[PDB]
Design a protein around this ligand. Structure first.
Ligand SMILES: COc1ccc(C2(CNC(=O)c3ccc(NC(=O)c4ccc(C)o4)cc3)CCOCC2)cc1
Ligand SMILES: [Zn+2]
Lengths: 162, 46
């Protein structure tokens, strides 16, 4: 069901998505160990993900949540990085595959820092890094993140020791 | 795993590092839509 529509670098949408990527990079306490060492990205491609069914499933739920929360979906745009990205664009997100407990338990994780999502593209802690070079700081191999529309509803506030 | 009762998600907010932004968790696939696929390289600092 999913089609991917390539956006052109002078599309305003390409530009605002890239700026959100670039501007939400921070330093990490592992000094780069998981996600590698960098201050910015080289964006290679941005594709709009279009799946009528996943969209309808999303908005239907968005509406339920909104009604439970004084007509406030609390919709954000957030990064997701993991090895599940190729499956997710085809099947949508599936909490049944999101069973590993993180800082905030089992579930589907998103980040405001693109660079945080980048730590997970090759697995937990960066796994063994890129498939080709086994290098968590690989500057050659292509990475993929998703920039997602996420319904938070009434969000439980969990202060972290981080 | 499920949302704490009476919530639809969890916000994981760093209390120590002031420069770190929030992470969030949801427990239902339908509460997110993967809207953009971004392919990129990280760049070696100068
Ligand atoms: C193996 O690489 C991983 C990378 C990151 C994770 C963590 C976050 N995991 C997730 O965000 C997550 C894991 C799996 C999914 N999977 C799916 O949505 C999904 C749909 C269809 C398929 C096959 O998977 C969606 C989200 C686990 C908690 O510790 C922090 C990160 C877990 C595993
Ligand atoms: Zn590599």
């Amino acid at each position: 069901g999913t089609i991917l529509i390539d956006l052109s670098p002078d599309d305003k949408e390409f530009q605002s998505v890239e700026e959100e990527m670039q501007s939400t990079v921070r330093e990490h306490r592992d000094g780069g160990h998981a996600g590698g060492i960098f201050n910015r990205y080289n964006i290679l491609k941005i594709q709009k993900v279009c799946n009528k069914k996943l969209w309808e499933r999303y908005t239907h739920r968005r509406k339920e949540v909104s009604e439970e929360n004084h007509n406030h979906a609390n919709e954000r745009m957030l990064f997701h990085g993991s090895p599940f990205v190729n499956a997710i664009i085809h099947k949508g997100f599936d909490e049944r595959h999101a069973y590993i407990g993180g800082m905030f338990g089992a579930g589907i994780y998103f980040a405001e820092n693109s660079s945080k999502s980048n730590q997970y593209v090759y697995g937990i802690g960066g796994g063994t890094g890129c498939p080709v070079h086994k290098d968590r700081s690989c500057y050659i191999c292509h990475r993929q993140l998703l920039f997602c529309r996420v319904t938070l509803g009434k969000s439980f506030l969990q202060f972290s020791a981080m | 795993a499920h949302s704490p009762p009476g919530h639809h998600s969890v916000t994981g907010r760093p209390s120590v590092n002031g420069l770190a932004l929030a992470e969030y968790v949801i427990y239902r696939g339908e509460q997110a839509y993967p809207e953009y696929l971004i392919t990129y390289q990280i760049m070696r600092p100068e």
